[PDB]
């Protein structure tokens, strides 16, 4: 198999850059259209990270920052698969996540929300997908977060995630929500996404059969990245 370029990103499946409803995008969105280019080695290559550098608790947000005790909150396990648009598994991709705590409070100098800080919770982790594109981490379910878009704006509970995989073109940062959260229907950020089916592609589903008795609940969340086409004739990439 001789790989070609990644399939074109379908701009209709993503939020536009300019979205008046999400105020901060007004001054931070180019006025010019993006210039599309044919891919080169620069776009189809990406860095490699060895698991050796990762600590044993890097994917355990419940314990990786626990000092004198356990964090206050809902013990939840999140897992799923990462695939490219053609269904192929994404192996050894770097997945990084961050979130607020059970109070909806972030451990960040710029966060001044009255929500209470948890001395035993950090809010960040990372992991590498296995050979099947599978990933799994443990955390405390984040609480909704009030922010100033319109004075009474509230982000539904959410976990920020980032992926660096096989090609630079796949570079992706996004967010996933929890099935059933009512704030999902009124979030200006989530509504920057055009289609309804795409908005639902960011909702983690309750995975009841994978709950761990008297311990933790579990959510299933799959991620889809762009995929490369195979080449059978001229190989122009180079």
């Amino acid at each position: 198999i001789i790989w070609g370029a990644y399939a074109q990103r379908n701009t209709e499946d993503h939020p536009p850059a300019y979205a008046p409803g999400y105020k901060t995008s007004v001054l931070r969105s180019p006025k010019n259209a993006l210039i599309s280019i044919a891919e080169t080695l620069s776009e189809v290559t990406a860095p490699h990270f060895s698991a050796d550098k990762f600590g044993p608790k890097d994917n355990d947000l419940i314990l990786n920052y626990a000092k004198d005790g356990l964090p206050i909150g809902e013990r939840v396990i999140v897992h799923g698969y990462v695939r490219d648009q053609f269904g192929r598994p994404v192996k050894n991709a770097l997945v990084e996540v961050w979130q607020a705590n059970a109070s909806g409070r972030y451990r960040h100098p710029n966060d001044q929300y009255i929500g209470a800080m948890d001395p035993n919770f950090g809010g960040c982790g990372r992991m590498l997908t296995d050979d099947n594109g599978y990933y799994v981490f443990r955390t405390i379910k984040p609480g909704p977060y009030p922010w100033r878009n319109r004075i009474n704006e509230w982000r539904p509970a959410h976990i920020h995630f980032s992926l660096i995989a096989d090609g630079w073109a796949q570079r992706l940062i996004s967010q996933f929500y929890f099935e059933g959260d009512t704030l999902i229907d009124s979030c200006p950020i989530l509504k920057t996404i055009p289609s309804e089916q795409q908005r639902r592609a960011l909702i983690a589903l309750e995975d009841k059969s994978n709950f761990i008795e008297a311990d933790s609940r579990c959510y299933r969340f799959d991620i889809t990245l762009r995929g490369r086409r195979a080449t059978y004739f001229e190989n122009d990439l180079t």
Binding site: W98, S174, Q175, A201
Partner: protein, 202 residues
């Protein structure tokens, strides 16, 4: 066939998960950073610095930057590289940093990349792939950084010549400077307004 997962802004606290140290969180022993030069890395060392301005001309103080580049010989430290050449064994080729909360300045300590092969047997001028993430930015913004001391190479570069509005090509060229014995390339990014930086859909 499945659809790509839809993008979302990185948010104001993108530092927590991507640059814990900067947010004062010490959970990881090994932390990814903006230093791509190792002890035995080959090539001339350069500093890449600049700022990111919004539509008002104000610098973003919560922006996160990442770069991807080839080694001194134009070979990427990636299994996806099909050049058949051996890559510098001491070069990750990638790095991450964040603007300073106060001044908005960002920087990387890296190596000046070698020329990389373009499509159809062409040669690309040396460049670094850079991506911007931040509150207000729904989808990571892609761009490239070329060097002004590579005038002849840039003139023949395929991507730069693919931009039909020639006046905009200059927005992708960083300016070389010298802080004594150190080579520094200044690259300011303008998201909106005049001299808006060219952004690519790769």
């Amino acid at each position: 066939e499945l659809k790509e997962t839809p993008s979302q802004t990185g948010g104001p606290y993108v530092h927590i998960g991507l640059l814990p140290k900067q947010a004062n969180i010490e959970v990881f022993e090994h932390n990814l950073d903006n230093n791509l030069v190792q002890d035995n890395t080959q090539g001339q060392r350069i500093r890449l610095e600049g700022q990111v301005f919004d539509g008002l001309g104000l610098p973003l103080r919560d922006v996160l930057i990442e770069i991807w580049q080839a080694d001194t010989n134009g070979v990427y430290p990636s299994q996806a590289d099909t050049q058949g050449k051996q890559v510098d064994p001491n070069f990750l080729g990638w790095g991450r940093t964040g603007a300073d909360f106060g001044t908005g300045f960002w920087s990387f300590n890296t190596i000046k990349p070698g020329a990389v092969p373009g499509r159809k047997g062409s040669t690309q001028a040396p460049h670094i792939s850079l991506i911007i993430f931040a509150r207000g930015i729904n989808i990571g913004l892609h761009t490239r950084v070329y060097f002004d001391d590579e005038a002849e190479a840039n003139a023949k570069d395929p991507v730069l010549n693919s931009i039909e509005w020639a006046t905009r090509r200059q927005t992708l060229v960083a300016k070389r400077e010298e802080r004594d014995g150190e080579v520094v390339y200044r690259f300011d990014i303008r998201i909106q307004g005049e001299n808006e930086t060219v952004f690519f859909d790769i």
